Amino acid sequence: LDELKKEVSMDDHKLSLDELHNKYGTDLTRGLTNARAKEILARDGPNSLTPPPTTPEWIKFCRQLFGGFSILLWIGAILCFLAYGIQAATEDEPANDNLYLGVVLSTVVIVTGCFSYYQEAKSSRIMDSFKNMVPQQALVIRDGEKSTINAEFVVAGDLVEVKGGDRIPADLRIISAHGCKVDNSSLTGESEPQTRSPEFSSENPLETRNIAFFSTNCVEGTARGVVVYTGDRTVMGRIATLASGLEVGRTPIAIEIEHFIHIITGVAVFLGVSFFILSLILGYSWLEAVIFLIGIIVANVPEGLLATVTVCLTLTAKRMARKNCLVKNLEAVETLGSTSTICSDKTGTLTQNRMTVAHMWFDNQIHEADTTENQSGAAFDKTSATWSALSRIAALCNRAVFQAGQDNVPILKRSVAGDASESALLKCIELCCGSVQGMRDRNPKIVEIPFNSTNKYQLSIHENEKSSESRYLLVMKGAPERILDRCSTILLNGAEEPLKEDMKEAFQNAYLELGGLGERVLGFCHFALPEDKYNEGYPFDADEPNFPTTDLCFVGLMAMIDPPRAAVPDAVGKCRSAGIKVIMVTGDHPITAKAIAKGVGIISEGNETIEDIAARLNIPIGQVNPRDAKACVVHGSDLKDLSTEVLDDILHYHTEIVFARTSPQQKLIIVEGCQRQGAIVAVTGDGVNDSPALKKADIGVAMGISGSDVSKQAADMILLDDNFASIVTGVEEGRLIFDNLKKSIAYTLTSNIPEITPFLVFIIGNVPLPLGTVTILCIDLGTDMVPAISLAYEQAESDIMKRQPRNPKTDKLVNERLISMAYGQIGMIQALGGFFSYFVILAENGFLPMDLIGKRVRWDDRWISDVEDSFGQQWTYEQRKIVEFTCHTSFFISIVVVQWADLIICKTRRNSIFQQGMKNKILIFGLFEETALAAFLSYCPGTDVALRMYPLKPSWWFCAFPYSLIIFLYDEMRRFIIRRSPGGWVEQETYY
Amino acid sequence: FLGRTGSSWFKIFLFYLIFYGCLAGIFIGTIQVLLLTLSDFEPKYQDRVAPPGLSHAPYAIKTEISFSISNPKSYESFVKSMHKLMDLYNESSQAGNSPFEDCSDTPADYIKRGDLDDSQGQKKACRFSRMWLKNCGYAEGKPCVVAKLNRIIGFYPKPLKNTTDLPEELQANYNQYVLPLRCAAREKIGSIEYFGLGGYAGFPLQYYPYYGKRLQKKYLQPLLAIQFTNLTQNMELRIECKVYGENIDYSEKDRFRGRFEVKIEVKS
C-alpha cells in the first residue's frame, strides 16, 4: 500500500511556463476562472490531508482481556459460576464461595486489563502535525484579481502568490519571483534559505529552484507560481500519509511478554487437564472435578505478574523523566537497551544546528576556536595584535545584531537577526572580545557596500576609534581567493609586510585544510586610508568606487561549520563500546556529512571509503577493491537507483556508514534495511524529514528543544534538554530493567509451586486441603506485590555497557533456566516448608501425619460432627475446619517466610549478597510491609470471615524458617559455583 | 531431542534424583523432630475441641431425618447407622475384669485412674449396657434417637448447680452427678421421652475423665436415648437437644457445639 510512497517523486519543472499551463488549463496572468476553480475542486477534491482510520479505544481495551492469563482466569471465573449454578439447583448451598470467587476473578481480569492497556499505549498524532503546516488561507489570482481564499479551496492550475512570512499552500511551479528565498528544512532538515526563481536549475525537482513545496515557508521576497499538486498528492503530503500510515508493530519487550505467557499458559493447561482426568479416574464427581480445576487455574496463573511488569516499567520511566528524558510509550523504556543499531540524523541531533566559527588563520598559523554550547574547550589566542585586527573586521564588517531582551540567555543560544555566517562571527567576537555593539559605537560606520553576488565581498568604512587618528579605516570580507587578489601586505604579528609567494602558498595550504574539514572559509582584510588624501569630511561613494579596493592588507582567514553538540562525540563512542552500530542518515550535502562523521566518531581515524583509497593511490575507483574500504558515504541520488538487496550488501559490508542527501522515504528505507538483517534499530532526529524513519524505528527518539512538532509526534521518547548523553543512559537503563524483570519474574513464579502442590497432594493423598484458593490470591495480589516490584531498583551486577546487545532470537526474558530454578528447585523447597507447617498445626491439635492419609472423605463430610483424631477425641464439623483454615493461614505465612529468602536470592543472578549488599531500600520496605500485611491478615478481627484467615500462635511463624534458610544457603552455594567456573554446567543450567 | 543431548539429559536426571532425595530426607527429618516433641497419651493443644460437641446416631442428610412409617425401606437407612453405634455396646464386647469394670448403676462421681502415664496398664473403663436404653429394628414410627457427648481427654463435664433458676426447673435434679439433656422445639407438638443410665436424662459422671485411645482402648462413653412419640404427623419439626453444664457452651456457627439440630418428619 505504502510501497508507492517509499519511492522518489516525478515532476514537471522541466516544462516551459506556457507548456505547464496547457497541462493544467490555466492562465499565467489572469489565473483560473471562479467557475473553473470550483469545477476542479469537485473533480480533484480539497487541498487537505485526511487522517488515517484509527482503532477505537474500546477494541484496544478488550483485546487485552483475552491474552493467555486472562483467558485462563476467565475459564476459572465462569467455572466458578458453573459450580455455583450446579449447587443452587441440587442442594441449596447458602454459601457464597463459587459466586464470590467468580466475581473476584472477573475483577482481577478487568483490572489486569487496565495495566496492559496502559502499557500498550500509542500516542500518535502525525497527520495532525502535518495539517498544521497548511495555512488557513492562501492568495490566488482568479479572473485577473488577487483574493484570499480558504487554502483547502486551492486546486491544481490556479495562480498563487507568496511573500516573506507565509507558508507554501501547495506544491507550486514558480513562474515569477523577486528575491524569493525559501526554508526547505521540511525536506532536507537544513534551514538555510534557498532561492526560488522561474528558471529550471536541476534535473532533480527536490533541488531545482522553480519548484516550491507544501510544508515549507517563504522567508523573504515574493513569488508567483502555478499549483501542480494539492492535498495528499503533494510531495510532503505523501510523506505525511507514509508516516501516519506505517504499521506500528510489536516491541521487543512486548514479544518477550507474550513468549512467557505461552510457556506458563502451556504448563497451566497441561497440569490443568492432566489432573482433571487424573481425578475422574480416581472416582471424583464432576461437581468436585471442576472445583479442583478452578484451584489449579489460580495456582498456575501468576495473577499479579503482568501488573508488576507494568509498574517496574513505569518506575524506570520516572527515573528517566528526572534526567530530562520523556517516555511516551512505556515499552520504549526497554527497546533502547536491546538496540543494536542507531540511525541518526545530523542537523539538530548530532549537531547544534548553528553556524559557528571553528578555526582562524592568522600569523601563518591555524587556530582552533571552541565550538561547544557551554564552551567546554580552551582559548586559542588573545595576545597577538593581529587577532585584534581580525576581530575588529569580524565585528565591524558585519550587519548582524542580537534580538532585543536576550541579555539573560547565553551568547551562543540567543536569537540573531542575520544570515548564519554573520551570526557566527557576531557570536565569536562577542564571546572573546565582549560587547560587539561597543566596537560598533567606538567606530562609527560612514559608508558600506553590502555583500554582492558579483563583488563576492562586503566592505565598510569606519571612523577609527583611536583619538590620535580618528581617521578612516576600511574593512572587507568575502571569498578567500577574491580577498587575496586585493592584498599587497599581510599583518604578521602586528607589523605589515609584503605578500611574497611564500605566505601566499601557506594561505592556499591553510585554505585547503579548513575546506577539507567541511568548513566554510572567509577572507578578512583591511586598509588604513591615507590621512592627507582623505579629510575628516571626505565623502565616500558606495555606488561608484570612490576609494581604493586593491593593495589592501590581508589580516586573516576564518572558518565555520554547524558543529557537534558537546556530548555527542563521547556518546557515540559509548554506544560503539556497547557494541551498537552507529549510522548517519542526513538530508545534508556529503562533504559536510562526512566531516561531522569524523568529528563525532561515526568514521574512526584511518578508515577509508573507496574514493579515499583511489585519491591516495591516485588510481581509478573501479581499480579499488571495495572490501578494502570499511567506511562508505552514499549520496541519495545513487541510493535511488539501488535495489534493497544492494542496500543490504552496503549495510553488511561496512562498519562506518554515512547516508547523505537522503529524502525522508530514503531514511525509512535505510531503517527497514537494518531491521531486515534482524537488528533492533533506534532512530534519533529532530526534523519533519525524520518522521517516517522515527515511526518505523523500533524506538524513535526526538530532540525536545530543537525538534519539530512532527518529529516529536513520531517518536517514542523525547530528550527535553537535547542532551545526547541521554541515549547512553537510556540504553543502560534499558539493559538494567531487562535483567531486573527476570529477577522479578523468577521471584513471582517461584511461589506458584507451593500453591500448586497442595492441590495435587489433596487428590493423590486424600488429606485435608492444605491451602485454599482465596489464600493464593492473598499472596499473588497481596504479599508478593511490593517485593516483586522492588527488584526493579536493583543496581547492575557488572558493567552492562561492556557487553554486546542481546540477541532477541536467543536471549529471552524467560527461558528454560528460569523455570528450572523457580519451579524445579526453589519453589519445590518452598512447597515442603508449606506442608511442614501444615503437618505441625494438625499434629499439635491431635491429628498426627499418619492418620491424615485418606481422611478427607470424613473430614469434608458436613454431617459427621464427631471425627476421631489420633488421640481418640471427637471433633464437630466447624471445629476441625477452624484448624484446617488455620492450616491455610500458616501455609500462607510459610510462603511469606520462604519468600523472604527468595527475595534476597532473586536480588542477584551471579553475584553474592555479600558482594551486592542490601542497599535497595524499596526491597527492605517490601520485606517489612509484606510481613506487616500477613500479620494483619491473620490477627485482624473479622478476617476469619472475609478471607478465612485465623490467628497463628507465635511458634507457628517459625515452622518454615529452616526452609527459608536452606534456600538462602543453596542459592548462595550454587552462585558460588557459577562464579568459580564460567565453564558452563551450573551456568548453562540455572543462570536465568 | 527437545532440550539437550543424552549426556545433558542424564546429568539433569542424576541431579534432580539426588536433589529431591535430599529434600525428602530433610522433610522426613523435620517430621521426626516434630513427633519427638509430642506425647503419646495427650495432644499438645485441646482448645479447639474444648466445648464438647453433641452428636447422634441417625445419620442426617442435612440435620434432618424424614421418612414414611407406612414404608419399610423409608427408614432402613437411619437404622443402619443406629445399629452401627449400638452394636459396639454389646455385652459380649465387655467380658471379664479386663479391661472393664462394673460401676454404679446410678449416676456417680468422677473416677481418677492416676495420671496420663503408662506407669499402669490399660486404664479400666466403666461398663455400659445398651439395656439401660429402654424401648430402643428400631422405632419404625416416632424415632428413638441416641445422643452422645464427644470424647475429650482429661475433660471433667461439670453439671450446673441449683443455685438459681433452670430450664427444667429443679425436676429430678441430680445436681451432684448428672449432665442433663433437654430437647425442645411454642411449637410444642411432640412428646419427649428420655432414656439413660440410672433412668436419668443425662450422662453419668463416673465415665470421666477419658484417658485417650492409647491409655483406654475399648472404652465406652455414656449414651442417652431420646424418643419422640409425637402425636403429630406430616410436618417438619425442628427439634433441638441441648446439654447444660459449667464446661458446656454453644456457638451460632457450630450448630453441634453441645447441641442437636434434628428435623424429624414422619410423613406417613
Add this chain to the structure above:
Amino acid sequence: EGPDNDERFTYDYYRLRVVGLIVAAVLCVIGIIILLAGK
C-alpha cells in the same frame, strides 16, 4: 489441677490478637522509616 483443670482447654486468643496487631503496626512503621530515608 484435678477436676479443676479448665485452663487446659483454654487459650487467650484475645491477647494474642492484641500482640499480633501491635507487632504488625510496628513492622509497618519501621518499614516506612527505612523507605522514607530518601523517598
